[PDB]
């Protein structure tokens, strides 16, 4: 039987196949609303390295509804994909992208060395190296203020114990696995005492 025939399918394509992604410190969030989401396209794909879901089953929510779904996309390196998970610490989890301990959603990642590497080294993807405090869950800091590492205070000038807070990844195609770039999509689900707009094709 041909079907189902759905027109307002959720735009997971323009998130997963976006020609250009975003740096992890300025991670990009896509709000999913007023659409039917066929998550089978996600887990039936054979082009993902990691598909870790927390507190929710991706094979069991195509008959479920949610008030809103958020799609967060960014780029890190293979060593840091394990940090996109609840209860993790490190440069990415503390200063770039933090997930709550009761995180409900999936962390999808795949190698993007063919896309985000240049022979001269790709230096467009940045990550935050220092910050005066850890990030709260789903917090986004884009400030470029000079980090004061010592007693003396910097006047927006870079120098002794005064660091620019953003460092670039050195994505060259010859890097080993773990230093080549990985594109990451983080789907998060919320359910409030409000109408639901993101449902599966079943109901």
């Amino acid at each position, epitope marked *: 039987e041909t079907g189902p025939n759905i027109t307002n399918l959720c735009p997971f394509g323009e998130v997963f196949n976006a020609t250009r992604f975003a740096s992890v410190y300025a991670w990009n969030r896509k709000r999913i609303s007023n659409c039917v989401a066929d998550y*089978s396209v996600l*887990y*039936n794909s054979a082009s*993902f*390295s*990691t*598909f*870790k*879901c*927390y*507190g*929710v*089953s*991706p*094979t*069991k929510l195509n008959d479920l509804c949610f008030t809103n779904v958020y799609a967060d996309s960014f780029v890190i390196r293979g060593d840091e*994909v*394990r940090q996109i998970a609840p209860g993790q610490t490190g440069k990415i989890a503390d200063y770039n992208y933090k997930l*709550p301990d*009761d*995180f*409900t959603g*999936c962390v999808i990642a795949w190698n993007s060395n063919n896309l985000d590497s240049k022979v001269g080294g790709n230096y467009n993807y940045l990550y935050r190296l220092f910050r005066k405090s850890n990030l709260k869950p789903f917090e986004r800091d884009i400030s470029t203020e000079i980090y004061q590492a010592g007693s003396t205070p910097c006047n927006g000038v870079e120098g002794f114990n005064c660091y620019f807070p953003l460092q670039s990844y050195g994505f060259q195609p010859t890097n080993g696995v773990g230093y080549q770039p990985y594109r990451v999509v983080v789907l*998060s*689900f*919320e*359910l409030l005492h409000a109408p639901a707009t993101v449902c599966g094709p079943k109901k």
Partner: antibody
Framework: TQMQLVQSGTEVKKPGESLKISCKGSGYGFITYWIGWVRQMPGKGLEWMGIIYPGDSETRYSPSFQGQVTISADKSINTAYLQWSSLKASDTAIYYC????????????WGQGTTVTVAS | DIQLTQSPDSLAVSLGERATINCKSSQSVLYSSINKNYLAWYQQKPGQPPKLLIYWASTRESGVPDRFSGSGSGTDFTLTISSLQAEDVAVYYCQQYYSTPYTFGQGTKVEIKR
């Protein structure tokens, strides 16, 4: 069916020998599945041993089985493993592998169990 | 580390009557994002793997009769078999999947009273 877990055959081993039993997931979408191991001693309840995500081999153990067993996985063949290095007589039990797409999700698929006997 | 205690250990109920099993958790299992308790109920029979009956404290798994129902919130949960039948005689475990390590209840035996 979304996923079926086939388990290795019955094992009759001697005290001191090593053993490795398998649990192969048959179905699509296995990239999302986490496989756990449950021990059920003869006439006793269910004991959750550990769980592993084959995609990156993240492994969590129960404090009662930390260091006593080794839960590995081979993501290229959708197979998870549970192995001992030195079998005791107190290891005689049936071992179920249970799967579920995601972590902190219900174990909604089970194999028919592997019965291990450490005696003559 | 969450510990579960079931009660009673043994339960005898006549055919067609209501059987209720209680499960107490040493800690809450409530996810705030999706207001759901991460508590499951399993049934096991001799020579058979455990069968998932109820998850999210009160949601029925496929292939489960309508007479199985779960309830509760916080630390007290209840499995209710209304109109107890012959093939419902089994051992019932409550499992929490809030966080690892996963833990089971000690088990509740349910028999027919005649």
């Amino acid at each position: 069916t979304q996923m079926q877990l086939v388990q290795s055959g019955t094992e009759v081993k001697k005290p001191g020998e090593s053993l490795k039993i398998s649990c192969k997931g048959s179905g699509y979408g296995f990239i999302t599945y986490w496989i756990g191991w449950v021990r059920q001693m003869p006439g006793k309840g269910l004991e959750w041993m550990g769980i592993i995500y084959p995609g990156d081999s993240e492994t969590r153990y129960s404090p009662s089985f930390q260091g006593q067993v080794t839960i590995s996985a081979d993501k290229s063949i959708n197979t998870a493993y549970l192995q001992w290095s030195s079998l005791k007589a107190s290891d005689t039990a049936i071992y179920y592998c249970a799967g579920g797409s995601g972590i902190s999700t219900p174990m909604d698929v089970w194999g028919q169990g592997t019965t291990v006997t450490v005696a003559s | 580390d969450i510990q579960l205690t079931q009660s009673p250990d043994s339960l005898a109920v006549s055919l067609g009557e209501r059987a209720t099993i209680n499960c107490k958790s040493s800690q809450s299992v409530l996810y705030s994002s999706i207001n759901k308790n991460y508590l499951a109920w399993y049934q096991q029979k001799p020579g058979q793997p455990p069968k998932l009956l109820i998850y999210w404290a009160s949601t029925r798994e496929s292939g489960v009769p309508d007479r199985f129902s779960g309830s509760g919130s916080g630390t007290d949960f209840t499995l209710t078999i209304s109109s107890l039948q012959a093939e419902d005689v089994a051992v019932y475990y409550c499992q929490q999947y809030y966080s690892t390590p996963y833990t089971f209840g000690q088990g509740t035996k349910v028999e027919i009273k005649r």
